[PDB]
Design a protein around this motif. Sequence first.
Motif, PDB file in Angstrom:
ATOM      1  N   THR A  86      -5.276  -9.564  -6.853  1.00  0.00           N
ATOM      2  CA  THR A  86      -6.850 -10.163  -6.991  1.00  0.00           C
ATOM      3  C   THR A  86      -7.232 -11.274  -8.027  1.00  0.00           C
ATOM      4  O   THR A  86      -7.832 -11.516  -7.946  1.00  0.00           O
ATOM      5  CB  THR A  86      -8.371  -9.109  -7.225  1.00  0.00           C
ATOM      6  N   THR A  87      -5.995 -11.103  -8.620  1.00  0.00           N
ATOM      7  CA  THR A  87      -5.385 -12.255  -9.633  1.00  0.00           C
ATOM      8  C   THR A  87      -4.954 -13.636  -8.944  1.00  0.00           C
ATOM      9  O   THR A  87      -4.618 -14.325  -9.775  1.00  0.00           O
ATOM     10  CB  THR A  87      -5.407 -12.401 -10.996  1.00  0.00           C
ATOM     11  N   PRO A  96      -9.440   0.963   3.508  1.00  0.00           N
ATOM     12  CA  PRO A  96      -9.337   1.787   4.994  1.00  0.00           C
ATOM     13  C   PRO A  96      -8.553   1.178   6.762  1.00  0.00           C
ATOM     14  O   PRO A  96      -8.091   1.703   7.036  1.00  0.00           O
ATOM     15  CB  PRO A  96     -11.100   2.038   5.438  1.00  0.00           C
ATOM     16  N   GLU A 126     -12.099  -1.592   6.432  1.00  0.00           N
ATOM     17  CA  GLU A 126     -12.624  -1.894   5.160  1.00  0.00           C
ATOM     18  C   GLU A 126     -14.027  -2.166   4.964  1.00  0.00           C
ATOM     19  O   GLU A 126     -14.987  -2.491   5.889  1.00  0.00           O
ATOM     20  CB  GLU A 126     -11.734  -3.007   4.861  1.00  0.00           C
ATOM     21  N   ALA A 127     -14.640  -1.625   4.007  1.00  0.00           N
ATOM     22  CA  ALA A 127     -15.487  -2.462   3.533  1.00  0.00           C
ATOM     23  C   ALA A 127     -16.270  -3.709   2.923  1.00  0.00           C
ATOM     24  O   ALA A 127     -17.067  -4.246   3.141  1.00  0.00           O
ATOM     25  CB  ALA A 127     -16.772  -1.707   2.491  1.00  0.00           C
ATOM     26  N   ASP A 128     -14.873  -4.871   2.999  1.00  0.00           N
ATOM     27  CA  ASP A 128     -14.848  -6.029   2.690  1.00  0.00           C
ATOM     28  C   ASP A 128     -15.040  -6.561   1.353  1.00  0.00           C
ATOM     29  O   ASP A 128     -15.397  -5.401   0.217  1.00  0.00           O
ATOM     30  CB  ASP A 128     -15.757  -6.383   3.877  1.00  0.00           C
ATOM     31  N   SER A 129     -15.841  -7.561   1.524  1.00  0.00           N
ATOM     32  CA  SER A 129     -16.195  -7.836  -0.129  1.00  0.00           C
ATOM     33  C   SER A 129     -17.675  -8.303   0.415  1.00  0.00           C
ATOM     34  O   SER A 129     -19.191  -8.003  -0.475  1.00  0.00           O
ATOM     35  CB  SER A 129     -15.654  -8.539  -0.139  1.00  0.00           C
ATOM     36  N   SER A 130     -17.879  -9.705   0.915  1.00  0.00           N
ATOM     37  CA  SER A 130     -18.699 -10.778   0.951  1.00  0.00           C
ATOM     38  C   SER A 130     -19.936 -10.250   1.998  1.00  0.00           C
ATOM     39  O   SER A 130     -19.901  -8.913   2.549  1.00  0.00           O
ATOM     40  CB  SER A 130     -19.206 -11.978   0.926  1.00  0.00           C
ATOM     41  N   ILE A 131     -20.730 -11.189   2.394  1.00  0.00           N
ATOM     42  CA  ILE A 131     -21.898 -11.551   3.314  1.00  0.00           C
ATOM     43  C   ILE A 131     -22.501  -9.974   4.044  1.00  0.00           C
ATOM     44  O   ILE A 131     -23.731  -9.851   3.039  1.00  0.00           O
ATOM     45  CB  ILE A 131     -21.426 -12.198   4.437  1.00  0.00           C
ATOM     46  N   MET A 132     -22.084  -9.134   4.060  1.00  0.00           N
ATOM     47  CA  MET A 132     -21.065  -8.720   5.768  1.00  0.00           C
ATOM     48  C   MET A 132     -22.390  -8.439   6.220  1.00  0.00           C
ATOM     49  O   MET A 132     -22.706  -7.164   6.591  1.00  0.00           O
ATOM     50  CB  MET A 132     -20.055  -7.988   4.878  1.00  0.00           C
ATOM     51  N   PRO A 154     -33.952 -12.256   8.880  1.00  0.00           N
ATOM     52  CA  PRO A 154     -34.930 -12.644   9.697  1.00  0.00           C
ATOM     53  C   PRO A 154     -34.739 -12.949  11.336  1.00  0.00           C
ATOM     54  O   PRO A 154     -32.886 -12.694  11.560  1.00  0.00           O
ATOM     55  CB  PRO A 154     -35.226 -14.176   8.936  1.00  0.00           C
TER      56      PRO A 154
END
Lengths: 108, 115, 121, 353
Positions: A13-14, A51, A53-59, A67
Motif C-alpha cells: 500500500t506504499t 474476501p 472486499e469491503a474496498d475503500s472509498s465512496i462505496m 439524495p
Amino acid sequence: EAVDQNTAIVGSTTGSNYYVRILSTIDRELLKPNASVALHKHSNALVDVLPPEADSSIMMLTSDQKPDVMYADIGGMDIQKQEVREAVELPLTHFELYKQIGIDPPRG
Amino acid sequence: THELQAMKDKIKENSEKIKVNKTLPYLVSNVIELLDVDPNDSQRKGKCAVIKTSTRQTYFLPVIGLVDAEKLKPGDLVGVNKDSYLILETLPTEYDSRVKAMEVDERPTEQYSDI
Amino acid sequence: APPALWDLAADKQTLQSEQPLQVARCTKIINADSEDPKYIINVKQFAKFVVDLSDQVAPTDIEEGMRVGVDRNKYQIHIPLPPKIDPTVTMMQVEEKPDVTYSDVGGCKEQIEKLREVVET
Amino acid sequence: TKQYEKSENDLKALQSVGQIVGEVLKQLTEEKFIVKATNGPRYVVGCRRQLDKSKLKPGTRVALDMTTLTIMRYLPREVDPLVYNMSHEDPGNVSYSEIGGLSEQIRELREVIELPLTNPELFQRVGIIPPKGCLLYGPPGTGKTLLARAVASQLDCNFLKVVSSSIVDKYIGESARLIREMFNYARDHQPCIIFMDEIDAIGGRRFSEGTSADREIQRTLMELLNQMDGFDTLHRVKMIMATNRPDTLDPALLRPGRLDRKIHIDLPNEQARLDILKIHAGPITKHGEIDYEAIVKLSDGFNGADLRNVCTEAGMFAIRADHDFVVQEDFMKAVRKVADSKKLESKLDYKPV
C-alpha cells in the motif's frame, strides 16, 4: 500479477513492487491476477488476499441514504433521454439480447 | 516539616530528568488541538491532543506534555523528539531566511539634505 | 597502473578517516537562534529540527539561513558551507583561460582605447 | 514545592508515547478493520475492549496504537483552517448605515440573505426555492468588499470568511478538497455564511490551454462546481461572491445555482454622495462652516473611499499648516485639486459585465 510457481510480484500500500515466495497451502485459486493481498508485518510475505472486499472509498448508495430528485418534472429533454432510454435499462438488464442481435453494447 | 527540602531535592532530581528528558525540542512540528474525556461504555479521565511533524505525519497523543493547553490554538514550532511525541515548549517565531527579511539594513548612509 | 596501484593503497587511511566527518550530511540551512545554547535548522530532505551544535562551532561566526554540516544522529552543527546554488549552467556561463589578445585588433585605435580606459585601465 | 512535584507527576504521565492518528476506512471482522495511515499504508487491526463498532463506523477519524496498532481512541471531527477564517471583525453593524448608498443594494441583499435564514416558510408559502448564495461585481463605484465586511458583523448569526489567497497550497494544489473540508463543517455548523472576494483568478478559463499552473487551477474549479452540483444541499450556507470583473468565470459559474443573483455597485449619485460625505464629515470635526453640496457639486463622480480618504487627506493637507480646525475652503481646493490628480488614473476603470 503472479510471475511463476510459488512466487509473485506485489506492490505494498506504499506502492513498491516486491518478489516473495507465496504462502504454501494456497498457491493460486484465490490469488488471481488482480487483488489486494495482505503482506507479512516484517517480511511482506505473500499470504492471502481480501474476501474481496469491503474496498475503500465512496462505496456506493447515495439513493437510500439520499439524495434523489424526480426527473419527471422536466420533459424538454425527452429526445436527449432517447439515448439514455435505450442505452441504460436494457444494456444492464439484458446482456443476452446483445448476443441475439449481433451488435455489441457500447460503453460510450 | 523539614521534608520540604527533600521534596525540593526530588523535584530537582526529576527536573534534572526534565533537563535530559524535556523532552528535547529537536524536530520541528505543528499542532492540532482538542479536548476529550472518555465515558464508558468503567469511567476514566484524561485528555488528548494532535500534532504535525516535519516529515508531514500526524499523531494522536494524550495532552501535552510538557506545557499544557495554556497556549495555544495550534501554532508553529512545538518541541518534540521522535517517539516521545510530547510538546515541551512553543518557541517563537515564523519563518523564513530571506523570505523572512527581504532586506534588513542599518539605513542609507547619506541624508536627502544633499539632493 | 603504478598510479592505479598507489591509488587503491591508502583506502585504508581513507576508511580510517572515513568514520569521522562522514555523517556530516545533510547540508542544512539554519533558521533562528533565540539564546546561546539553542538553534533551529531546516533542510530540503523535509527534516526541520531545533537542535544544538558541536563544540567546534562558535555562535558569532555563523549566519542565519546558512548551509551547514551536521551529524544527523545528534543533529549537531559540524561546519557551515558557504555555497548554495547553482548548477553547471553557471559553470557553462562562468568561463576561464585566456586567448585572443590585443594584437588581433584590426587597426581600431581609440575606439577600443576609449573602452580600454574604462575596463583594464 | 508541592505544585512543582505535581508538574513532575504530570511529567510522569508524559513518557507514554502519543498514538498515531487514523481513519477507519471499513471493517472485515471484529478483529479486522480496514484502516489507513495518513501516509497511505492500509492496515487491519484489532480494537480495544471498551468500544462497539457503533462507536466507530466505517469512514471514521480514529487513532491506533504505536506498536500493536490496535483501535483505541478517536475523535470524529478535526481540521486546521476552519475557525481561523472566522476571526476577521468589522466595526458595525452600524457600518450598515455608514456605507451611504445604495438602497436596492442595501435592502435587497437583506431579503436575499436574512429572510432565507429566519423564515424559509415564506419561501414554501409561495413555493419558491431558497437562494443559496449571492454575487457582487464592479468596480464602477466601490464598496463590494466593505458592504460584505459590514454585513458579516451586521447580519450576525454564523459567518465564515474565505481568504482567497493561500488556496494554491504550493506543492500539490489539490486543495479544492479543502472547500469540501470547509463545506463539511458548513454542513456541521449550519447555518453559516461565506464571503468570497476574487473568484475571477480562481475563475480561470482554460480557454487556450497552456503550461502547468493553469491545470491545477481548472482542477480546483471542478470541485467548486461539483460541490454546488450535488448530490447535496448546501442551502444552509450562503455563498457570497465578488471580484474585479464578472467575465472570466466561464458560463458554468455564471448560471444561477453557482451564481444565484446579480448585484453590483455603480458610481454613487451625488445625491447619495451627499450622504457619503456625512459619514465622512461625521468623524472629522472642524469649524462649523460647511456646505455639503459644495464638495458634492465641486467634486463629482467619485467613490466613498475616494471621497473620504481625499477628504481626510484634504484635512491632512490642510493641517500641514499646523492649524487645527479647517473650513471647507482648503477642502473645496484640496479635495478638488487632489482628486483631479486621482482622476488621472481613473482611466480604463470601466469593465465588462
